[PDB]
Design a protein around this ligand. Structure first.
Ligand code: SF4
Length: 206
């Protein structure tokens, strides 16, 4: 189902990434510029998963390059997180979007079907990196591993462990960094410190 037959039998991230460029596991490859695979090395101890590449990522060919990526980088700073320790990816690897009437590309939420279709890449990445801890950045990513009914709001910052996940890594669900780019300054400050806390929990896993 989905991307399964497009995934090669290798843990090599370069080769996985190249194969993802050829994926037709759902419809999203058609309109997107290219696949945006994860970034980092198989030595990474912390895997971070967002929803999908955004406008800038789709064209940069790298995850977390936009304003959300800047904000996340500021949080890793405050959490004493070393980028050498990070593998960062997204639950789906092709940007799903529409053009706004007023010409910037606006991301659209991946359907559960698209998440499940792309999940074999995520499993391949998880099997390749063998992380100690996986940070789920927002509801789409968290549901991809924790179930379609999972609520980030009720469990954020808790160390979770599900038996059906490769290598039984610890799992920490947190807010989507994009959500912290909007709202009252004092609320964004509180949300940022909560993200930092969730990141410190993950970094303190072992
Ligand atoms: S979003 Fe994922 S499953 Fe769908 S075509 Fe792209 S790489 Fe394949």
């Amino acid at each position: 189902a989905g991307a399964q037959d497009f995934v090669p039998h290798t843990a090599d991230l370069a080769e996985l990434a190249a194969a993802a460029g050829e994926c037709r596991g759902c419809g999203l490859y058609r309109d997107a510029t290219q696949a945006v695979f994860g970034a980092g090395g198989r030595s990474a101890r912390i895997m971070m998963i967002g929803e999908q590449p955004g406008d800038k990522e789709d064209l940069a060919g790298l995850p977390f390059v936009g304003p959300a990526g800047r904000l996340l980088d500021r949080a890793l700073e405050a959490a004493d997180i070393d980028r050498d320790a990070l593998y960062v990816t997204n639950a789906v690897k092709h940007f799903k979007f529409t053009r706004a009437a007023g010409k910037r590309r606006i991301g659209k939420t991946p359907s559960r079907t698209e998440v499940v279709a792309c999940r074999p890449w995520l499993i391949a990445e998880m099997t390749s990196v063998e992380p100690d801890v996986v940070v789920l950045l927002g509801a789409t990513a968290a549901k991809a591993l924790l179930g379609n009914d999972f609520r980030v709001t009720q469990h954020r910052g808790e160390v979770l462990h599900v038996d059906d996940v490769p290598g039984d890594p610890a799992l920490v669900a947190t807010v989507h960094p994009s959500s912290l780019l909007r709202g009252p300054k004092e609320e964004r400050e509180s949300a940022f410190a909560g993200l930092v806390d969730d990141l410190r929990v993950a970094a303190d896993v072992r």
